[PDB]
Amino acid sequence: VQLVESGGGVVQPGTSLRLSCAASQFRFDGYGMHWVRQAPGKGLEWVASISHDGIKKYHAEKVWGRFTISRDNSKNTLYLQMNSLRPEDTALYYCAKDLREDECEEWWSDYYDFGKQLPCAKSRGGLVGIADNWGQGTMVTVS
Amino acid sequence: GLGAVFLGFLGAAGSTMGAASNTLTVQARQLQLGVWGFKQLQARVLAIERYLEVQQLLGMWGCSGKLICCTNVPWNSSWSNKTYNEIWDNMTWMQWDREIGNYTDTIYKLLEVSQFQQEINEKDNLT
């Protein structure tokens, strides 16, 4: 397994930035992802959370309206738009991966055929808040 | 055979009533659930229902095994006002039943009471 992040670098106060997290060695559309941050000398802190398809998005209370998260089934990366950079935002931003896989239970079918593999209909399994794989992360710096 | 006996009665249907009583003598001297499996069953039950119906109707008034039996009902003059020489010598049986065809229910009822009344008077000869 290997998780690599992108979008990091030096930024200026008040500007914008979009982080990326390339996923590999596993089924991208079958696991949820989490974004964390840990200030130097402090503890970790959740940033955002997304499902396997991106229909459910959740963030922190302090970044409502400014921080967003989305994924893409054709390019397999996680986006995180960070606006209004603040000096208290410098932290160890990592890319997390959930463990619970959305195992499908009812696929769409076609009587008189029963051979065509149609998309899924009723899947089970959401986010659990457990990160089994942690990338190297990209360090951000604002001043 | 129930079928071969009802066909012999229909022989000589064009002869007069006076000669039909003796013509039958000279004619008898020389002598599983499919659609087809259900109509045969429905026909045998209909054959039995027609044989005893004409047989049980006889048993009500005296006659049970006879053929030329006589009854004790006086012949009216309103049902048929023709002489004996014309009925039994110049008319077939099919034509005769077209004349008295209306006096049928009034006759079968009169034949029954004329025989049931006989049993009451006969069995009262001991009291």
Partner: protein, 108 residues
Amino acid sequence: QSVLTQPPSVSAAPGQKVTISCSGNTSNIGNNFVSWYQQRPGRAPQLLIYETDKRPSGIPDRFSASKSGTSGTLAITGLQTGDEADYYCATWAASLSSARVFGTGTKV
């Protein structure tokens, strides 16, 4: 904007016993499971405790943890020199975003 009350640093001598606690509130741990993690100095974090009662196949039986009401406690036996690292507490619930708060860190 909740926080997990944890000791910033505790003494860890080879052979003694170290307890790591995690006290929160009712909204974050009173109705949801709790987890645990370890972040060694200069290394990436890793999963240690999931579902509050199950452990991955990569860790020995020395790592153990439990919870009691609104507070959880981590009890580990067999302390060595290489175990001195930063341990965290973690709660997560999809209902409200006030339950997703990491621990402040426990340096052993």
